[PDB]
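Key idea: predict the complex, not the pieces.
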Amino acid sequence: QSDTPSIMAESQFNSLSTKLDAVNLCMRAIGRSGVDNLTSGDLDAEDADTMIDIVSQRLQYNDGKGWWFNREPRWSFAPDSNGEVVLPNNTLQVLQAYTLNTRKIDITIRAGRLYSTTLHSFDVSPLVGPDGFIWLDLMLMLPFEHMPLNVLQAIAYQAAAEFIVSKDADQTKLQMHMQMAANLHTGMQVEESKQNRLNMLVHNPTQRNFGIMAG
Amino acid sequence: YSYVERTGDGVATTFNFAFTGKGKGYLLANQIYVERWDGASWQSATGWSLSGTNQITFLTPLANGQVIRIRRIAGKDYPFAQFEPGVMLDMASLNNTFIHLLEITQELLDGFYPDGFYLKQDLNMGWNKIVNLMPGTDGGHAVNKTQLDTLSSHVDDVDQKHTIWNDRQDQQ
Amino acid sequence: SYGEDWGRPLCEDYSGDLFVVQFLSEAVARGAALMADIKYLIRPGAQTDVEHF
Amino acid sequence: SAQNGWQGTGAQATNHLANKLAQVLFPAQRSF
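Result:
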C-alpha cells in the first residue's frame, strides 16, 4: 500500500560541501577537468587550493565586520602573570567590549599578542578592567568547512573568477563570473541583516533613553 | 556522526535526521533504523515510514517527552561491490564501496557495538577517569562514588549513634 | 443602561479617538527626536584626516 | 504614577470639563 516511501527514497540531491568539489568547480570554465585528489601531482591543483585559502578571509571580512557566524561576543582573557595575553589562533580583527563604566583604552594587534599604543608597554598589566579579564570583541576565521552552504557557493565563484583572470584572458567568461558571483553576494548579504535583526530603537543608546523618558 | 536523537513533544509527527557524509549519508534506504526508549531499554519502533529525504512520518503523534534516535546500519560482512573480468569499471560502485567501508567506521567510532559484544582481554585507560555511571544493581556490577558515599555516611551514622549510646551510659 | 448594575463613563465612547491621538503624538515626538540627532559622515578615500580636522 | 504619557490633551480636556460642570451646576456665590 502507498508509494511515497518507495519512489522518492531513490531520489538524490548531491549538494556540494567538500573543498575538492569547489576546486573541481574552479577547475572548470578553464579547460582541463578537475583533479580527483586534493594533493595529486598537478601544479594547477594546488594553485586552486591557494586561491581558496587566500580568498577565504578576504570574503569573510566583508568591509569591516563579517557576517553573523564571524561574530564573537564578549571574551575574557585574564592575561598571565608573565605578561601580555596572546590572541587565540588567527583573528581577523579585535575590538574593545562596550559595556557601561568602561573607559576607552587602545588595543592593537601585533603578531598574536596585542599592543597598547598609549601605554607604549608591550605588556598590559595596569589597563586591566576592575575585576574584569580585559573584555573585548574579536572575529575568528572559520576554515573552508564549518560554514553555511550558501557562503561555500559564494566563495567558490569569486575564487573562480580570480583564477581565470590570472590563468587565462577572456572577456566573456570573466564578465559572467564576476557579474553572477556579485549577484549571489547581494542575495546572501540581504539576509545577514534579515538575520540577527536590529532596529532603530532600543539598540541606539540615545533613542532608548528618549523612549524611557516621556513614556 | 551516525546517530541522530530526537525528542518529540506532542502533535509533531515528522522527525528529521542527519547522518555524516557527503550528500545524504546512507547508501540504501534499508540502512535506516529507528529505536524508541521506553525508559528502561532501547526498543525497536514500529509504524514509521519514509516521507522525506531524511524526515520520517509516524502513524500517530509521539507522547510528550518521548525520546527516540535514528541510526544508520551498514552491512558488516561483505564488501559493497566485487570486480570481475570483462566488465566496465564503474566509478559509481567504486565510490559507494569507499563510503561503505567508511560508514562502518563511524558506527564503531561512535561506540555502536553489536549485540553479544565483549572484549576478550584486559583493558586499561592509562590514568583516566570513568564518568556518568549510576549505582550498580548486580553483585558483579561496578559501583561509583555515590554508593561509596552512601556506605560512608552509614558508617558515620553507626559511629554517631555509638557515641550517643556510649556517652549517656558513662554517667553511670 | 437597562439591567445594568453600574454606569458607563463618557471616555468609553472616545477611548478609540484618545488612542489614535496618542499614536499620532508618539509618532510625531519620535520622529522629532530622531531628526534631532546628528550622525556625521566621511567618504572613503577622503584625502583628508579627521584627527587634524 | 500620574504621567500623562505621550499625549496630555485628554487629561486637560477632562479636567476642564469636570471643573466647568462643577462650577456651573453648583454656583459658589449663589444658592443652587
